[PDB]
Amino acid sequence: TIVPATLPQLTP
Amino acid sequence: TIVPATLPQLTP
Amino acid sequence: MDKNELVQKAKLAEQAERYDDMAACMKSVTEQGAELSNEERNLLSVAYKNVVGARRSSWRVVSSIEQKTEGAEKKQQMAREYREKIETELRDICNDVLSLLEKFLIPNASQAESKVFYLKMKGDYYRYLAEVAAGDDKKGIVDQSQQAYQEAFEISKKEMQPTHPIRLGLALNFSVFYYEILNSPEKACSLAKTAFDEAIAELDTLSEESYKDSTLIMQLLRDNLTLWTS
Amino acid sequence: MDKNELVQKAKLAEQAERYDDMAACMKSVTEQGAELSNEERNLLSVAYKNVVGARRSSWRVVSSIEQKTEGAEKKQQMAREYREKIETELRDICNDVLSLLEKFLIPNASQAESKVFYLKMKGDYYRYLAEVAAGDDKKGIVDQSQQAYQEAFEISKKEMQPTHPIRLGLALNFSVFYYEILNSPEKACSLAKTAFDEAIAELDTLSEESYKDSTLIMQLLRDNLTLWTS
């Protein structure tokens, strides 16, 4: 349900 | 320098 | 697209943080000529504040970089050229809003509540234009802002309770105009203090929903006053 | 406009958060046909991630609403049409990035580092296309994403150390592709776990600078595994 980490990442 | 508050306020 | 369909789209765009779409949706509904509802009036304000806000913020970042580049003439020259491109986008947005206010919203406003709202909005967009105005044009834009704010201020004092969010919000912004634009801090402080003191006296007369709304703004007046006073 | 000039504008656009301008500048630098420098390569990657990211985030928000509206047929229909408009913008951005990779970046890549970086970028953008892909079209697009990631994976294992950030970053993204796209929790966990452990063996051979860089990504791998394993 939650967002797993990927690169590049946003600022945000 | 810093702020001040005005309306409407931006969605961060 | 139906005018009711456009409003729903604007609500979607708002959640999706697609403010260009939001503003376009609301600009079309205003173009229909039907008097905007409170809900629709706030969608239009939020839409364009977020649209103009991105450029105001960019203008500040690029201006700060321009001051910091007391080194390379080419880098600083590039920042100045970029800032000008941002200023041009900001003027198009402002004009777009001010045009909607003169042609369809201010003339078609029957109640004072709405006249004040649109006049405050007119004051806000002239203020934004005055921040990036050419030195010769400055005064003319600065005077147009003041006039709209002052007209809204006079109507709100005569026709609206001091606890009204629109009247409180007008004072907040007008006060900021005095401080940030006219560089007149004493006037900004009294304006905002007077507006807070008048609202404080009538808090016992508000309903639960009215109380949350007015207090939120009153706190913003207090936040600015503390920042200015300290 | 000088390639050097466009890069300074891209850095300016990044500071002002005008990612639309940043991507246009980096696209122009790439189109000049020369191979990108590491700094230019990083700017192009950040630019398009922010541009594509806005639409991925908007797509997720609109999809949420479209689901939760089981109580209104017209509102759900409005959400679907808006999601489709967002999906069209997303496909154009991805196609534009994939066009740059095939026409200029992948062919001109000389070092393995860049080859893996461009191949990983190709997998990433096909993965984004796969998320909004039509039901028949999805299987082909998913295979294209896998093939590009797999080639990048094969080159990184042969030509790069386990601690290299690009190699580490590719493993994190490739493991995520298995999890959310191919729905393969086992392969996804094993791919991330292997990448992490191989990195752990060579931590002693790293300098202070490459240490922040490697351990940052290894933590992201550990965070994903924790999410998946617990």
Numbering used by the authors:
A (entry chain F), B (entry chain E): 519 to 530
C (entry chain A), D (entry chain B): 1 to 230
Provide the authors' original text about this structure.
The mechanistic details of the GR–14-3-3 interaction were further resolved by determining the crystal structures of 14-3-3ζ in complex with GR_pT524, GR_pS617, and GR_pT524-pS617.
Of note, these two sites belong to the GR LBD. Details of the interaction showed that electrostatic effects dominated, with pT524 bound in the positively charged pocket of the 14-3-3 monomer made from K49, R56, and R127. We also found that the kinase misshapen-like kinase 1 (MINK1), not previously associated with the GR, phosphorylates the key T524 residue and that, in a cellular system, this kinase is required for most of the binding of the GR to 14-3-3.
